[PDB]
Symmetry: C3
Subunit: 332 residues, 3 copies
């Protein structure tokens, strides 16, 4: 037996009306495939003589180990996209432009414009609040070594006439000077001043000073000769006063120096000394003393003498002469 089977091309079977007997094999000549009869179905309705089911295969690949598009996408959706997020480098680049609380260097202007909760009161208020209670350094240190400039080191301005606080308030306890102004010996000379004050206020002193010294002056002024030359400073003074009219005024009636004691003092109201020796003084009652010969380009009105060293008046002289003239003419 060399057995051969009913056979033709797949497409010819496809339209054959031949019914294979149950288990009778038929052959597709162009595919090599067989199919077996069931006794009723046409060829195209028979299945192949061997399984075609993925689940019966051997050497299957690991389908279950492979990632699904859905599950991968869900996992990607939790991850941050490059474009919506700064790198470490761009983060640091941005942060290096900001000021550390530990400290840093400003190259531009720091403005304050408080919104003002209340901005407090005392040692806990202010837009800038500096507490040096636990440290030995300075608070605010401003300086310039520039040759010239357009602005002061520090400027304080108030714009409204009702303003009811000070520009600068110094409340000081300690053992040196609350406020100290040193104007160092000039090389190129200024025609100006350590401290300069002008007021146009007619209802208040330009400067007020109250002190309560046991044995010093409330204000102490010392002039020191700038030169070793004994008389170089001959036009200088410890205190100089001028009294002037208003530009285009008719003049002035202001006094130079006015001294009073509202409670009454027993001290000398004006005491002038040289080398610590009294030279001239006005006592608390208005009597004066002068150490040396003095001059008046005028007369002197005073009372009649009662002691030998009293200056005589014209009355006293005239009377003593008139007495002598009478007696001497003789008396009956």
């Amino acid at each position: 037996l060399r057995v051969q089977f009913k056979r033709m091309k797949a497409a010819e079977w496809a339209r054959s009306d031949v019914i294979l007997l149950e288990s009778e094999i038929g052959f597709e000549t162009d595919t090599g495939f067989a199919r077996a009869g069931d006794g009723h179905n046409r060829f195209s309705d028979l299945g192949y003589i061997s399984p075609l089911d993925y689940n019966l295969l051997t050497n299957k690949p690991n389908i279950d180990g492979l990632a699904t598009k859905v599950e991968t996408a869900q996992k990607l959706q939790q991850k941050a996209d490059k474009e919506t997020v700064y790198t470490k480098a761009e983060s640091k680049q941005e942060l290096d432009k900001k000021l550390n609380l530990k400290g840093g260097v400003m190259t531009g202007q720091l403005k304050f414009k408080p919104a003002a909760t209340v901005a407090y009161s005392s040692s806990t208020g202010g837009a800038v609040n500096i507490d040096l209670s636990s440290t030995r350094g300075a608070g605010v240190v401003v300086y310039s070594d520039n040759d010239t400039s357009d602005g002061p080191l520090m400027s304080l301005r108030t714009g409204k006439e009702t303003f009811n606080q000070s520009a600068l308030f110094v409340d000081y306890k300690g053992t040196t000077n609350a406020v100290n102004i040193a104007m160092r010996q000039p090389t190129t000379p200024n025609f100006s001043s350590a401290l300069n004050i002008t007021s146009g206020n007619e209802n208040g002193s330009a400067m007020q000073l109250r002190g309560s010294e046991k044995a010093l002056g409330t204000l102490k002024i010392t002039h020191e000769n700038p030169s070793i030359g004994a008389d170089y400073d001959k036009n200088a003074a410890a205190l100089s006063i001028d009294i002037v009219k208003k530009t285009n005024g008719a003049g002035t009636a202001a006094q130079g120096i006015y001294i009073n004691s509202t409670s009454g003092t027993t001290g000398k109201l004006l005491r002038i000394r040289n080398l610590s020796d009294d030279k001239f003084y006005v006592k608390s009652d208005g009597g004066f003393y002068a150490k040396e010969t003095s001059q008046i380009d005028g007369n002197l009105k005073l009372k009649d003498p009662t002691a030998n060293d009293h200056a005589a008046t014209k009355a006293y002289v005239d009377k003593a002469i008139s007495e002598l003239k009478k007696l001497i003419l003789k008396k009956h």
Copy 2:
């Protein structure tokens, strides 16, 4: 020949004891599948007559191109999760709340509380350190155009009596005034002062001033009439002094003006002029000069005259009279 084969249902083969001859075909009537004999195995132990090995298939899918769960997970593990990381927008939102070193606007309080390395000394110390050496602007510019307020523009306070530094130190070189206080002509008038100083310190002057002017006063004061009216300021003064007791004190012995030269000066100790003409002065030795008629409501003690223009004393008058009385009575 129409060949048919030993046949029955798969499940019936499954328990048949029939041994197919080597290569003899048997048919599963309900599956369509054949199996071929090996001459020993029961039907259920024969394999199908055609391969069932994934590796022999054609049109395989690209299994190797597909991603594995393991390898995807490893790759996801290097990526940043959305939730642990700021977006660019939230980054910028946070950074815009911080101050740029280039500059910016504070809306709240900046406090300093130095921890203090040493906080240095001189032109490199301070919690706030401003160096204007290479620029032409101002250092610290504080101002207010508010009508009223509860606090000063600037406040300096020291709390302990041992405190051994100044509240404010000005070390100045330059060509204008180190410190300048302008109190602008008021519209609504203050009863106060450009500069006001009080000290309760009995061992130190409230204010100390030293200068070394060639031809000016160490302190120069000018009063200017506030009005064009010649005598409007008739109660005004360039300098006014008061001398008062302590509240509930018995009084005071303090002097008004005390002038000394500890090294000895040849200048006039008190010089009073009007329109630049000497009117009254006290010389370095205590002699005074007065330009016009003067009055004492009292006597004047002085020495006996020796020149024609010297004031005479009662002694001198009495003696000259007593001489004339004698001579004239005549002498034996």
Copy 3:
């Protein structure tokens, strides 16, 4: 019929020259596989009698649902890597080191070194610019409650002699004192001063003051007795002046107090009172008044008397005596 087929091992077929007839089955005894003849090809060139094409299988897996390495990699490439990006925690850790514009606490030094656009001029310049126009708090509040320190609360320094701005400028409008210095009654006593000024400048006053008061002094000084003891302050003064030579100088010619009116005043140039009663004064023309007995340790040069209360001169006395001597001797 029990049909058997041409058969041998796969490897033996592999080199057989037997040609199966068209559809004649041949069997591989070691694999179980059949192949069918085409009438020309050797065994090894026939295909199996049943399909081996993945596309004809049933129960296929969802290959299309699975993610490709390429497509996953493209998706991963858009995601940010953990290592190149800050977590929220490290972001906040960095940001907490920076200063909020809302406010914050500096623990280190804030330096300014302006690059200077121009740094402006007026109420819009300065490295630190504080505008309190809409608020009621203080501007700059510096204080210390430390026992001692190495630096001042505030320090202003200019290094070059040409410097042509002020260290401190106060431009004040308002109703209290522009600048106020309180030196609180000491418990441990300082030998120093509320305000201390030194100048080595020979071409400018150490301090300049101009005021235009209707009825006050430009400078007002009050000394108050520190004690209830009436004469405790007997060495004190409201104003004290000293006039000294330069260290290693030959001396000085400086004046003590110099008073002038450059425009001419009709006021009293020096007025001394006690309990508000005139005790001594120098009029605008140089005439003086003294309330009580006075003394000169010297002579007084003055003009010849013309009124009864005028002091007499030696000339006047000598002449009146010489007249009496003549008349009395009698006249022919």
